[PDB]
Amino acid sequence: MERIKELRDLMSQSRTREILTKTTVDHMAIIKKYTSGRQEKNPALRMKWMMAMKYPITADKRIMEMIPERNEQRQTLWSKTNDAGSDRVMVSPLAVTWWNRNGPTTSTVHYPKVYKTYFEKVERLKHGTFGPVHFRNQVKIRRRVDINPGHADLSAKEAQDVIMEVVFPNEVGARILTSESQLTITKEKKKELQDCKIAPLMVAYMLERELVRKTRFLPVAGGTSSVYIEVLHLTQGTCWEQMYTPGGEVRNDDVDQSLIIAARNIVRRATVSADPLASLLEMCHSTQIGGVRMVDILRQNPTEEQAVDICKAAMGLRISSSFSFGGFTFKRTSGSSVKREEEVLTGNLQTLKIRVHEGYEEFTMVGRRATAILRKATRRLIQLIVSGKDEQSIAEAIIVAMVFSQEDCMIKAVRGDLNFVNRANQRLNPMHQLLRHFQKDAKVLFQNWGIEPIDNVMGMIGILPDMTPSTEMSLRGVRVSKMGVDEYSSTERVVVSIDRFLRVRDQRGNVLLSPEEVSETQGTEKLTITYSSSMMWEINGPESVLVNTYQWIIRNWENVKIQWSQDPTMLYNKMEFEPFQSLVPKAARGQYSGFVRVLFQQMRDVLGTFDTVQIIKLLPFAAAPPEQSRMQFSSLTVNVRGSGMRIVVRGNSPVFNYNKATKRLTVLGKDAGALMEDPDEGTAGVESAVLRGFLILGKENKRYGPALSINELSNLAKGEKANVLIGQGDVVLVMKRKRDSSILTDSQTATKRIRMAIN
Amino acid sequence: KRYGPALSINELSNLAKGEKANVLIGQGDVVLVMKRKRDSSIL
Amino acid sequence: YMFESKSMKLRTQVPAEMLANIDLKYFNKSTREKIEKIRPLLIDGTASLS
Amino acid sequence: MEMGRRIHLELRNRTPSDVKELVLDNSRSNEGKLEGLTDEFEELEFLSTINVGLTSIANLPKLNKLKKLELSDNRVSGGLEVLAEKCPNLTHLNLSGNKIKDLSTIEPLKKLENLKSLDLFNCEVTNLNDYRENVFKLLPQLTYLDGYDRDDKEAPD
Amino acid sequence: MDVNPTLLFLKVPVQNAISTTFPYTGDPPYSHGTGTGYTMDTVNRTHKYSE
């Protein structure tokens, strides 16, 4: 055929053969950058010149069979010529227009599917709403913002893998054939694009555009959502503004909040622990956030918070050399300081052990509602500038800055005791206590802080102690800018040191982060959170404890079922069931356990009536001393934060909802998971031919037979080994799996063994 | 408090014969109640 | 009367004192016909009805 | 999937005489008529047909042990004498989402004296004024309409 | 089968159930009948009937 004959021609010459045999496929793309042509400077002039010619458009040989030589007016569409470097026949724009007006027609059913991003833009515009323009001074604060809504926020590598599986089915790398998580999106796309004639490279590029995230540094003055950035030209101006709203669909996720809560819980529960470092590491390695391990999210998500930063420092990575103090992200900009320990007596006869910075340092702070700068000397506040939308933002920012300054003037201005203790009843460090105290009331300090006149100049105004604008007098080094201050432009990530106390210390010996700086606020998990760690369900509560128990049961469904079929007793005495029975009242747990145990006895006695859902629902209740009873229960009470929740043995219940149509299980509304089944004959062989779970066996082996294409591996028998071409032309011997394990659990046992040995 | 937390009068229709609960009868007092095993008939 | 422009999303109100001399393109067919009928009576922003 | 294949799959390589509950969900029927089911089924006790695309229950066999029959989210309309005679032992019935005009077509269900519960939802009959009480009058044997009794009390199992 | 209050008159003489036809028995909340176009039409009709 043409391809192999061309390869033979290439091999005939000495140099082409030498380059073929020498260069490895790894460096193929390196010899793709050795272009001997010449890039056309000023292509606009070149295009203007070219269009005047007769045949400036290059078409392919096949065009000779479909488009006739001349049209009705005898104009010349295509010419019997060839391009410089190939066999591309020469044609004129007449050929393009003739093809459009009289060419063969097909169905563009897949074009909307491949081009969902552009059509999504179309829909978002078509359903928008407008409002009156307003003319006024515009302030466009500069910041980073999303670009393309509708993305899955996948890493470039994951998007490449998805594209390779979707459009390049039998050319996927070894990682996919040695991979387990066949993403749902991949199968969705494979089903969507079954019969698509579009050029596969175009499909790949469009999927890449659709599934990737992008961020840009822009000046915005209003809404920052992704759908509010694609129309930034229409919305914001230098002197005007436009009221607009996209009318499509927003995809604001919540995994960031879940990660915040998870990290906060981990730090709060490990700070009191004996070995916070190894403990937190073990937790992070064995925790799942909405069906995905937390390690991937930590490596992927660009979150910035004290808990996550300390987690990174413990695990070992780079974090910003700054701290978010009082709800404001700080950043050093100029000068240097030295940390010195001292004891300070406040105005309430309270002695506090503090560490103050001595030096002529400068910081910039960016909060949720303000932006400020602060130049501080050795225990001396020199200059403070703030800008904020509201007066309250101004006041909180200034309070944060002054408490950070840690000057001696405010020390004598403390009124009332500073004995604030966080919700965990752990003593708060003096600076945080002072911050909260001055948040509560600072009028006395304002009266006794400092007052001096200021020269009047444009663009900046003073502030009186009652937090009102002033032009003739203000506080010492306190000023407010009438124009917004642009945030920090860059952040420095440096190597940092972490101690067992979860305190992050810089290379100069100073401390950077502490768990005490972590906010103790509690939120709600939008997405379910699963743990396989130790008795760490301290803040989980019953609501999430139920879901965690059901998740743990369903993860080990095979082992649980085998134990129930063979050794029910040991399964019943499992330790992991301890918290569930805590919720069940202590005056009835025996009756529930006995009832469920006798029900299981009847279940095993009978055959052909197997029901997985009932067993999963009723297993945790069989973990208590089974006192005999005769009453036929129908609703087993389940205490949930002082609210008796019952479980109906037959049929669905609010505390246990399983949908058969979707075969999905959820508990108290929260997501729990799904079962591994499809036909009503206890098998899982009915799938879409998932081509995963293969193990290589070294280089090609001739005995096993001629090499097979990946697409035809599906015919392989259980455990049969053959030769297949993986990657971009690498023949290897592969087999089907026989032991239902994965690569994740490897090294864990030896990991713990060597960890014990070292310590 | 050892028995099932306070129930609702409507929910009591699902308790089995001989079952016990901690139903909230009214006002601000909780009363423990057991479902009669027998059945009282009338003309 | 009250006029509104949907294109620019604007609203304005005009008094009766200026109804004697004003364009009739703003109003609809019936309203402009009524204005045409009652134009020759408005004295100092007050019609005459004997 | 189709009817017969679904029934064979549910049977689980067993004879059509040892099934106490049959689940036919999201199936399809040709010409909107029941197919597959035959007299051999004599132990069925809990049937369910949802989104099955049946125009009417005109080919239902004599499942004398049929007690919990469900025809939900379908477009069944016509005479119900076939259900009255073929399965005279129905106890729980569900017609939620069906296409029924008025009580003149739901009258034949009065023949079954064991119907302890009849469920209707999103139907044309329920639009009529005093639908609940009129149906109760038409079906005295009924005790729980739409999962509620004559005095609006939820019906525990 | 479907409510129809008017059918009451099929046996009751209308004069008895006249209160059936007084929808409001109160002061409605819209105040329809005051403005400028109503004055325009009033003046126009007054001068038209005296053509």
CSV table of C-alpha atoms in Angstrom, one decimal, chain D residues 42-110:
chain,number,residue,atom,x,y,z
D,42,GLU,CA,-49.0,-19.0,39.3
D,43,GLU,CA,-46.9,-18.0,42.3
D,44,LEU,CA,-46.4,-14.3,41.5
D,45,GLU,CA,-47.4,-12.1,44.4
D,46,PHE,CA,-45.8,-8.6,43.7
D,47,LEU,CA,-45.8,-7.4,40.1
D,48,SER,CA,-44.5,-4.1,38.8
D,49,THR,CA,-44.6,-2.5,35.3
D,50,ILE,CA,-43.3,1.0,35.0
D,51,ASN,CA,-42.7,3.0,31.8
D,52,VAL,CA,-43.6,-0.2,29.8
D,53,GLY,CA,-45.4,1.5,27.0
D,54,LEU,CA,-48.6,-0.5,27.3
D,55,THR,CA,-51.7,0.9,25.7
D,56,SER,CA,-54.1,-1.2,27.8
D,57,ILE,CA,-54.0,-4.3,30.0
D,58,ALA,CA,-55.8,-6.6,27.5
D,59,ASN,CA,-53.4,-9.7,27.5
D,60,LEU,CA,-52.9,-10.2,31.3
D,61,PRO,CA,-53.0,-13.9,32.2
D,62,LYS,CA,-54.9,-15.4,35.1
D,63,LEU,CA,-52.5,-14.7,38.0
D,64,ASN,CA,-54.9,-15.9,40.7
D,65,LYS,CA,-52.1,-15.2,43.2
D,66,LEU,CA,-51.6,-11.7,41.9
D,67,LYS,CA,-52.1,-9.4,45.0
D,68,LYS,CA,-49.9,-6.3,44.5
D,69,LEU,CA,-50.4,-5.2,40.9
D,70,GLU,CA,-48.8,-1.9,39.7
D,71,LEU,CA,-49.4,-0.1,36.4
D,72,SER,CA,-47.7,3.2,37.0
D,73,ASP,CA,-46.4,6.0,34.7
D,74,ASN,CA,-48.2,4.4,31.7
D,75,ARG,CA,-51.0,5.3,29.3
D,76,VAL,CA,-53.5,2.5,30.1
D,77,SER,CA,-57.1,3.3,29.2
D,78,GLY,CA,-60.1,1.3,28.4
D,79,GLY,CA,-62.3,-1.4,30.1
D,80,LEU,CA,-61.1,-2.9,33.3
D,81,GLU,CA,-63.3,-6.0,33.3
D,82,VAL,CA,-60.3,-8.0,32.2
D,83,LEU,CA,-58.5,-7.1,35.4
D,84,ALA,CA,-61.8,-7.8,37.3
D,85,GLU,CA,-62.1,-11.4,36.1
D,86,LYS,CA,-58.6,-12.6,35.2
D,87,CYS,CA,-57.1,-11.5,38.6
D,88,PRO,CA,-60.1,-11.4,41.0
D,89,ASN,CA,-57.8,-11.5,44.1
D,90,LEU,CA,-56.1,-8.1,43.7
D,91,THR,CA,-55.3,-6.4,47.1
D,92,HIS,CA,-53.0,-3.5,46.3
D,93,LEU,CA,-53.3,-1.6,43.1
D,94,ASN,CA,-51.4,1.4,41.6
D,95,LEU,CA,-52.5,3.4,38.5
D,96,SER,CA,-50.6,6.6,39.2
D,97,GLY,CA,-49.9,8.6,36.1
D,98,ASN,CA,-52.3,6.6,34.0
D,99,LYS,CA,-54.8,8.0,31.4
D,100,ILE,CA,-58.3,7.6,32.7
D,101,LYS,CA,-61.2,9.8,31.8
D,102,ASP,CA,-63.9,9.6,34.6
D,103,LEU,CA,-65.5,7.2,37.1
D,104,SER,CA,-67.5,5.5,34.4
D,105,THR,CA,-64.3,3.7,33.3
D,106,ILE,CA,-63.1,3.0,36.9
D,107,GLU,CA,-66.4,1.5,38.0
D,108,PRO,CA,-65.4,-2.2,37.0
D,109,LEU,CA,-62.8,-2.2,39.8
D,110,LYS,CA,-65.6,-2.5,42.3
